[PDB]
Design a binder for this molecule. Structure first.
Ligand SMILES: CC(=O)N[C@@H](C(=O)O)[C@@H](O)[C@H](O)[C@H](O)CO
Ligand SMILES: [Zn+2]
Length: 478
């Protein structure tokens, strides 16, 4: 009869894009137990949300937090943005199922150091998660590149049919053990020689488990539209849910092509369930890639193992100091991290406004000077693009990081403020919410978020990240 907590008089967004409704929200244990008029109800704790907004906890659909959640269960970078659930294992790289013969192949170093990959089966990863749990829920995809590395010593080639068969079985086992689906990162060196038929070889296993396919496209530059055909073909052949990761048209050649990306979804054929996600910035981030070096836009070096004295500098400035070309400078800087200001802001706005588009940070948790998307993505959508820019309403912005995302990833009883769903919740000031992380100060926490609950326990409150550790591993339904 009594409940743990009642949030009073918040402006409540249900997560479905519907208009907010002023009402009260009752939490008991892990669940939203009552909605609406709750002065009758008996609550241990009472939260005065007057002048504030309540929304479902934010679902970061594009993370590389596979190992971060284990090293850093508090997950301040995500929790301080209001993120209550992370989707791990993106762009073909995951922490499990993985056995490392030698070093971790590029770009698996984005996840952690070689010694951290102790999860040969997915269940070992889940068990590792369950030791402490974390402030966020975890739903895990399996990385295609990671699977290739399990069965290939030389990755600069297609897998053999027999290697494909091994990987199928590894994926199938991972899917049975809880994984949500498969991800690829076909633009990366160690996956790029994987033909489309190799990716196709996973479709029957995915369909069997009613699992997801997500893809960092084979290219995001001139031939991005050809690369999207590959993703759609997965959906056409197998009728599975497909999500194109951090949708963009990168490169000076391609600025203004966002309408073409949108119209490309008209070529899906029979089905039309393909989705996508983006981060709210006109700059990408990854390791320094010689193929992306250009003087067409700013490229900012975030770290260099060869030349750490040149970290946090523009490639053009490093090149000038060094008396050599940008490409030659980049070569001497490798291995290195970079922020590539390769995208056009109007393209970003259009891709963000696209109703298929979920918000994902693509935060890189191992970068010593991260792209600020690691710390600002979700409040930037809410404060910058919604409130300030007016690209979309607050209900729309919230929908694209809660209900749309729970639906597309089939996260049961999450992403929506509804009775009987889990109490992942964020309490924030619609007028104050904003990202503070800049390209210079990229770990500055966002403003305007007052309180976060993961599964009914408070993981953030009044600028403090709290180690409730109430997240769960969200195992796939099958
Ligand atoms: C880890 C990761 O996948 N990062 C991508 C991103 O930040 O969007 C990046 O690799 C981009 O694909 C390229 O820089 C071209 O834009
Ligand atoms: Zn990617």
């Amino acid at each position: 009869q009594p409940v743990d907590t009642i949030i009073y008089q918040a402006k409540v967004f249900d997560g479905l894009g519907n208009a907010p409704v002023h009402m009260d929200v009752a939490i008991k244990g892990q669940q939203i137990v009552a909605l609406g008029e709750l002065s009758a109800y008996q609550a241990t704790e009472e939260v005065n949300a007057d002048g504030l907004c309540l929304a479902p906890g934010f679902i970061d659909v594009h993370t590389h937090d596979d190992l971060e959640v284990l090293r850093n269960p508090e997950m301040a970078a995500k929790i301080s943005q209001g993120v209550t659930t992370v989707i791990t294992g993106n762009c073909g790289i995951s922490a499990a199922p993985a056995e490392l013969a030698n070093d971790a192949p590029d770009p698996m170093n984005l996840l952690g150091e070689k010694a951290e990959f102790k999860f040969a089966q997915l269940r070992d990863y889940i068990d590792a998660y369950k030791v402490q749990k974390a402030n966020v829920n975890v739903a895990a995809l399996v990385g295609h590149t990671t699977l290739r590395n399990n069965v290939m010593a030389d990755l600069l080639r297609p897998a053999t049919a027999a290697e494909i068969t091994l990987m199928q079985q590894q994926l199938d086992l991972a899917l049975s053990q809880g994984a949500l689906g498969l991800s690829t990162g076909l633009a990366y060196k160690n996956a790029n020689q994987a033909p489309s038929s190799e990716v196709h070889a996973f479709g029957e296993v995915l369909k069997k488990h009613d699992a997801l396919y997500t893809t960092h496209l084979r290219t995001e530059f001139d031939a991005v539209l050809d690369a999207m055909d590959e993703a759609f073909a997965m959906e056409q052949a197998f009728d599975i849910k497909v999500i194109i990761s951090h949708l963009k048209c990168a490169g000076k050649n391609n600025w203004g092509r966002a309408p073409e990306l949108l119209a490309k979804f008209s070529e899906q054929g029979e089905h039309s369930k393909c989705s996508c996600d983006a981060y709210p910035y006109a700059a990408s981030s990854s390791t320094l890639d010689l193929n992306q070096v250009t003087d067409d836009f700013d490229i900012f070096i975030t770290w260099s193992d060869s030349h750490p004295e040149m970290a946090e500098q523009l490639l053009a400035d490093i090149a000038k100091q060094w008396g050599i070309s940008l490409l030659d400078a980049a070569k001497q800087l490798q291995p290195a991290g970079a922020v590539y200001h390769g995208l056009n802001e109007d393209d970003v706005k259009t891709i963000l406004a696209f109703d298929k588009t979920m918000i994902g940070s693509a935060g890189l948790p191992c970068d010593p000077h991260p792209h600020p998307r690691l710390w600002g993505s979700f409040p930037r959508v809410l404060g910058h693009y919604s409130r300030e820019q007016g690209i979309f309403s607050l209900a729309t912005a919230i929908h694209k990081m809660t209900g749309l995302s729970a639906a597309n990833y089939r996260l049961a009883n999450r992403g929506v403020i509804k009775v009987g769903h889990f109490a992942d919740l964020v309490l924030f000031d619609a007028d104050e919410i904003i990202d503070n992380a800049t390209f210079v100060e990229s770990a500055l926490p966002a403003s305007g978020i007052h309180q976060v609950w993961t599964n009914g326990q408070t993981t953030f409150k009044d600028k403090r990240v709290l180690p409730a550790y109430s997240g769960q591993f969200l195992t796939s339904l099958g």
